[PDB]
Design an enzyme around this catalytic site. Structure first.
Site: not given
Ligand SMILES: *CCC(=O)N1CC(Oc2nn(C(C)(C)C)c3ncnc(N)c23)C1
Length: 306
Positions: A140, A144-145, A158
């Site tokens: 992932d 955004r992470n 994350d």
């Protein structure tokens, strides 16, 4: 043939945390900001507290992420400070004051220079290359992470999807996956590899060079597998020289092995950051940039208890 994971899981008294405010309750769960003061230590560590968003055996998944975060130690990976075993199970981690890199690249896009962009590319490749050393597949990786400690220092976070490999391929079963960041093999065969993360790294770099654009904007995620099979990829961002875009294109090659290694991505972007304006054409290459009683405030990266 694996080493014993002798990482320490620190259980933290709910009394040790104070001045807790709200930071957001998006798809990541209710995340708070606050200060962790270890008893009888005279330090105040800015932290983020996260509880999933009850007691519905979602309490199980939050312990999975804590296991992973407690087993990493790298300047470009977020490390777990401890967990709080109150009515809800909470992850306590270092406060990244500038938030996610995706919202940062958007809100400051008229003040981000080629030096910053290329440096972030180096630091994410250093963090990912560390996760590869520890036999960990992120699954992932996205803008955004990646959280921003300072404009000059970013860290990967994350680890909900992260999975630890033995001593090559990982086979997931189902559930919501970020389709627009996954390698083609991850979409069709649900195979995940460190080289599958390189594809995600490529989409992550494309997010930054476009200053936070949505990859494959306005096209249903069900179509993504087909158009990627037709040989189609994300476009060359405007500020991108062919040098930088050629690296992104290499990350999205169908042969997973002929993709760049994370150790090789560090080298190439490091060489590029040595002369940023030769590789990123940005208009106007610019500068980039907590409560009173702050005498004993120690950032978590300087609070090391062995
Ligand atoms: C990019 C928007 C966004 O995802 N976030 C703002 C909010 O901040 C935040 N979330 N976390 C975790 C614990 C949920 C990853 C943080 N950890 C540390 N620091 C901040 N600011 C976090 C997430």
């Amino acid at each position: 043939g694996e080493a014993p994971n002798q990482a320490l899981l620190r259980i933290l008294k709910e009394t040790e945390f104070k001045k807790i405010k709200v930071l957001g309750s998006g798809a990541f769960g209710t995340v708070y900001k606050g200060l962790w003061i270890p008893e009888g230590e005279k330090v105040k560590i800015p932290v983020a507290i996260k509880e999933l968003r009850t007691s519905p055996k979602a309490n199980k998944e939050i312990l999975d992420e804590a296991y992973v975060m407690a087993s990493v130690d790298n300047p470009h990976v977020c490390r777990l400070l401890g967990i709080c075993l109150t009515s809800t199970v909470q992850l306590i981690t270092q406060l990244m004051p500038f938030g996610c890199l995706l919202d940062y690249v958007r809100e400051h896009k008229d003040n981000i220079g080629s030096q910053y962009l290329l440096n972030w590319c180096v630091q994410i490749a250093k963090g990912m290359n560390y996760l590869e050393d520890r036999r960990l597949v992120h699954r992932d990786l996205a803008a955004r992470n990646v959280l921003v400690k300072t404009p000059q220092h970013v860290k990967i976070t994350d680890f909900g999807l992260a999975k630890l490999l033995g001593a090559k391929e990982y086979h997931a079963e189902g559930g919501k996956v970020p389709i627009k960041w996954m390698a083609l093999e991850s979409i069709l065969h649900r195979i995940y590899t460190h080289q599958s993360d390189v594809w995600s790294y490529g989409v992550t770099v494309w997010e930054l060079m476009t200053f936070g654009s949505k990859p494959y904007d306005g096209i249903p995620a069900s179509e993504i597998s087909s158009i990627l099979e037709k040989g189609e990829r994300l476009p060359q961002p405007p500020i991108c020289t062919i040098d930088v875009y050629m690296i992104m294109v290499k990350c999205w090659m169908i042969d997973a092995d002929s993709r760049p290694k994370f150790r090789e991505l560090i080298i190439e972007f490091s060489k590029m950051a040595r002369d940023p304006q030769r590789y990123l054409v940005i208009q106007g290459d610019m500068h980039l940039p907590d409560e009173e009683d702050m005498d004993d405030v120690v950032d978590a990266d300087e609070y090391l208890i062995p």
